[PDB]
Write a protein that binds this ligand. Structure first.
Ligand SMILES: [Cl-]
Ligand SMILES: [Cl-]
Ligand SMILES: [Cl-]
Ligand SMILES: [Cl-]
Ligand SMILES: [Mg+2]
Ligand SMILES: [Mg+2]
Ligand SMILES: [Mg+2]
Lengths: 408, 403, 416, 412
């Protein structure tokens, strides 16, 4: 019996590869056939997991056939919701990919949502983001094959198209600016991706806004300033060296900009990407595809599904375009910084010109409130300080050089 | 029309005193310019391009055993020479098995050039096989000092240089994918490799360094130090300025090192010169030290010069892993830094003893030449990659207390 | 006072239309009497050059060249509507009357166009192959052209010398340099969707394949090693000529591109045996007329850059393909260059997608017609670079500012 | 009630194809049979001329016909319906501001966007009326003018003039004339005849427009000219790239020196002018010539397009226009011989000026032309070609560059 096997199983059954409080309890089970299933296992600490199960009971490994049986289920029960999309095929064969991700049929990617939110709490809105884009004709993304949710429905697994010959933005955008610096590309040729990124972002927001639109309240815009001023104080307190001395001096002028958010009540809030930057854009032979709709990892898990301004994605991409230029100057030996520095301003300009034009073409002008550009941009650069002191210490140069141009 | 009047009719040298006819219209000519500049132009009278068959005919001339020797050229073939077909300083892949490299820019008449032909030939005659398998060497006879014209070695497509596989090995060590012993095996095998390379190159003889030689070493190493002290900015420059008196005192040890053996060396030895091909390691690029002028890259150097070049690069691999990897655990990496250098030196010293060549390595040169290799990283940073100053800073922070 | 004596005593400018702004004396080699004092004359000048001269007697015992309105083109249409000359009539020929000149020729009956082959090849030399091209398309079912009415040739050797052609007149019809530019402009300002702006490019690929399949029915010739060798010599001479004459910044970039362009031309030596058929020769958008959704191809006189005695020779079918795909690129450059306040992003996206729509429809239609082997796609890259070099030569010789088209075209070709 | 139906209507009613409501009808001209012309004011005090019909008039509903039929013999004191000899009750409307071809021989042009209450608008009704008052015939035959009574400044609502179906504007026939000159199909004297005829047309036009009045330019007027022209010069120097920008940057000191001589031109006469004068505003119809488009300079503010200007402003606008016609022919025509074209450039301007000066002397009105303004106003005209180029057609910079290359050494 499923519930009799999971309860008597080792509490580490919910783990792909340290300590899980036991015993376990099976809340929901989706039988996939031939001894395969998708389990919603509840540990002793009231934590919920998504566990692909296979009988002899052990956790499914890449090659057992559970991700394969899930894709076959999409190509054809009350607690679960299987929503398939045009293009799902019953391909076979499994292969692990440490992006848990499993390549099925060498053309689809099954991703298990290992850690689930608590019973009732919101989780990842990736199922609602991908479904809204699909229903809205948004094609600049990996072709969705299916979504497995638990009745907002809790996301359990997703199947999208696999693009083996595609690179993320931290590869092709860096390569573009490098070829521009050494004369292999013209300035207009280097600005072309940024313009197409703006068109992509507006098409994404127009498709995502088809669900709804929530006016921001006074408590909403007030909570933004509280969190942003709280992150600024954490950055000032933790960023060391000469970068920290400049950040401490720039902190008063930044907080003054943050206070301008109180007057921006009533600004539209829609479903957004959340963690939008160049690295979330895959290029495949002139075509661009956006991935990763789980939300901003720095936000709490129960807030990664909340609606945000459309300008939040705009400042996230424009800042990454700025960061791409800083990386090219920082890493490339003998690089000419003049074309790269000139590309930083023009790429952000090309992006905004195309993002604003496409919104007007799609009758979605009021989605973008450009009064949020300056405050959210500074908040993005402050996050770069926090990411550096936590994961990559030398990365502090990126926001330091970016804020040097933003604060003349 | 003969080859002389045929070539005298200027872009022919860019992708006549001697002509090596390869048959069927293909040939190799040593063409001279109006500025007395000598060139190796593959002729066919257009300049040979990949697909014409000139480098393919050169390979056929190597695999052809018994041909009458030309009085001007010297074609020294090896066992790897095979008449492969198909084509793909200029380099041309021949038959996906050999790589032909035309020495486009030649030294002046009587001026020494690349010693690559002497290095490869000495290694092949000494039984050294940890390199791309040599096929042949084309040299121009010039009075007990051959001028390299073309090099033909084996082709290794899936081979990565050290700045890829060593950085990957250490990065896997920091994540637990490799044990410490596994990550230390390549360093120990490089030491065995370097000792075999020096023992084979020393078969051509050794020259005792004169008092003027070791004095010239200190002069050049102080000028690099003063240029580094005057260029490196910020807090790293302040530490280098405080370390400069202690570094310059170690440079004074060279005055009493007259008579140390100088042999044919690699010249530009670091981990990026070691390829990982077919589970084995291969050393490449025997052109000499790039920072030395063109006419000094063939000169003999201490064997410890290749040693410090590899041990320093092994240290720098660890610094790169800690610097570039987010969430990295620096403790296993820094433990590997000291252990890999020990594994290299311990294997290099024992292998030399097993070959009766322990007198090639003068470890008294180890500390002074290592400091000069780290200070030379400062000069690379301020001139090419400014943020690179962290590498010689973190390296000297570990070296100076120990030494 | 017969025709021969009148031509022998006439001023040598008799053989010229209105380009009188020719060494004598003249000599009449052929005379087709059309009746009532009208005739078509083959006049040889003192430099052995031959001409097609419409003649008319002026009543006073003299002769003069016919003008639009004298009735000589009128009598030719009547002759086609019923040995030495060959009056080959096609379905649709009618004895219409009334003449009207047009500068591109005489429009007869307000429904037919008569074109005189003013300049002829030397005696025994081959000239314009237009009579053989139209006849091959007509007997092959090719309907995407102005309706052929008649052809007047002179029997001489193996190829009859084309003297005059009569095709249907399409009033108001525009060539590609008008409707393709208009389509892309409408696309640039949102008046057409992307799929609507690509349909003409797809239909041109179907047209070209139907054209090549019909023309190849007269046979094919494998290119010899000497043929493909002459291609590289001619194409490299044109590159050296463009480098030496193209000025400005475009010339500076072309000098840095010449070593790479010449590297492409070295791929021709492995193309011996590729098929050569009767081709259009001067194929581009400007040769495609649009008349109420239908497309029609014109001007089969050959390529003007080649010598006159080589414009009838067989060429690779890919020559017409790279001619059209390059002009599709040139349409996009012209739209961006000439249109004020133009959005270049949809125009440049059209340049790439139109060439793919043309090639895909061309490959498929050739496959539907069992004519796959006519198209050697290995010629696409070398012939495309040669076509852009020809743009440089046209600019420095006829329209100096035109250098921007091959400059901006090669700026997008070389990086890829 | 017409006012009740417009008030409760969608605010987009004033658009022909974003307007704040509610709408308020200020005046309504009853045309009959359910047709009317309405002056609708939006909630932002933006006034509109809206053709109305019971159940916004579309081209084909008949409202443009009823306006033409009303001109064939005002029914309301608030409006002024000045008809002319030539208005015929033609039927059949065809759309082509909003212009509707009525009867295939008349053009009815609605003034969709009206000026604010009390602010000046298009002076087109004053221009056409003054030209007809003086007997000027070299224009499309006017049929009628519809204006709203508003003090001493009637607000233009609609204008009806004759439709010339086969007439081409200057940028067609002038370019064609110069091309035929380069091919030898026209003699030099034949290609210069239109330039003289335009000179006579411009002087006849100015003499009729100057009859309405003449204002001496104040010291602040000539001072504002130099400031505006110096800003346009600094703006072009800072934006024109390439070698053309390097020459303009080096020419700018010499050009700005000519802009300083305007301060002595205080008191120069200012009259009602065309405001946007070039060859493209001249229609050639069966051997005759007709001037069109009397709305004013489109780069000026809307409430400034009716202000009086020097008569020399229209002169330099046409002489520079003739210069650019030659540059276009050389630039676009393959195998063209530039020698007769460049000879025509200098000869056409001389032919235009000689006829202009002679006709003003014929009409005893040579005082309105101050030739001291020729050089500075011509420089400003060419400088604006740089601005139009960098803003709309980037390669157009060759036109003012080739023009200033001949003007600068000759004028100085
Ligand atoms: Cl970095
Ligand atoms: Cl680094
Ligand atoms: Cl053009
Ligand atoms: Cl133009
Ligand atoms: Mg990502
Ligand atoms: Mg044509
Ligand atoms: Mg106009």
């Amino acid at each position: 019996n499923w519930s009799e096997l999971v309860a008597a199983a080792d509490p580490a059954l919910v783990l792909p590869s340290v300590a899980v409080p036991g015993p376990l309890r099976l809340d929901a089970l989706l039988d996939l056939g031939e001894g395969h299933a998708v389990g919603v296992v509840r540990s002793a600490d009231a934590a919920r997991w998504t566990v692909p199960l296979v009988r002899d009971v052990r956790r499914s490994r890449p090659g057992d056939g559970t991700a394969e049986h899930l894709v076959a289920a999409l190509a054809r029960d009350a607690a679960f919701v299987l929503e398939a999309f045009t293009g799902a095929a019953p391909v076979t064969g499994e292969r692990g990919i440490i992006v848990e991700s499993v390549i099925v049929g060498e053309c689809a990617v099954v991703k298990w949502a290992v850690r689930l939110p608590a019973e009732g709490e919101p989780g990842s809105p990736a199922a609602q983001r991908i479904a809204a884009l699909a229903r809205g004709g948004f094609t600049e993304m990996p072709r969705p094959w299916g979504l497995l949710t638990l009745a907002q429905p809790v996301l359990l697994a997703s199947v999208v198209a696999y693009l083996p010959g595609a690179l993320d933005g931290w590869d092709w955008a860096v390569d573009d600016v490098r070829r521009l610096a050494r004369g292999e590309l013209t300035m207009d040729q280097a600005l072309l991706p940024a313009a197409q990124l703006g068109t992509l972002t507006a098409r994404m927001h127009a498709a995502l806004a088809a669900r709804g639109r929530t006016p921001a309240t006074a408590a909403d815009v007030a909570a933004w300033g509280v969190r942003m001023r709280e992150e600024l104080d954490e950055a000032v307190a933790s960023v060391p060296g000469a970068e920290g001395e400049r950040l401490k001096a720039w902190a008063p002028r930044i907080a003054d900009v943050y206070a301008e958010l109180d007057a921006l009540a009533g600004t539209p809030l829609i479903d957004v990407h959340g963690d939008f930057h160049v690295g979330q854009i895959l290029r495949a032979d002139g075509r661009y595809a956006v991935v990763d709709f789980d939300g901003n990892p720095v936000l709490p898990a129960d807030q990664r599904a909340a609606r945000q301004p459309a300008a939040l994605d705009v400042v996230g991409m424009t800042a990454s375009l700025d960061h791409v230029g800083r990386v090219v100057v920082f890493r490339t030996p003998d690089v000419d910084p003049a074309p790269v520095r000139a590309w930083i301003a023009a790429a952000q300009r090309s992006f905004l010109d195309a993002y604003r034009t496409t919104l007007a073409r799609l009758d979605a002008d009021d989605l973008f409130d450009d009064r949020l550009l300056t405050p959210l941009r500074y908040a993005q650069e402050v996050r770069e300080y926090l990411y550096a002191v936590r994961h990559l210490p030398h990365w502090v140069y990126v926001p330091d050089l970016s804020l040097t141009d933003l604060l003349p």
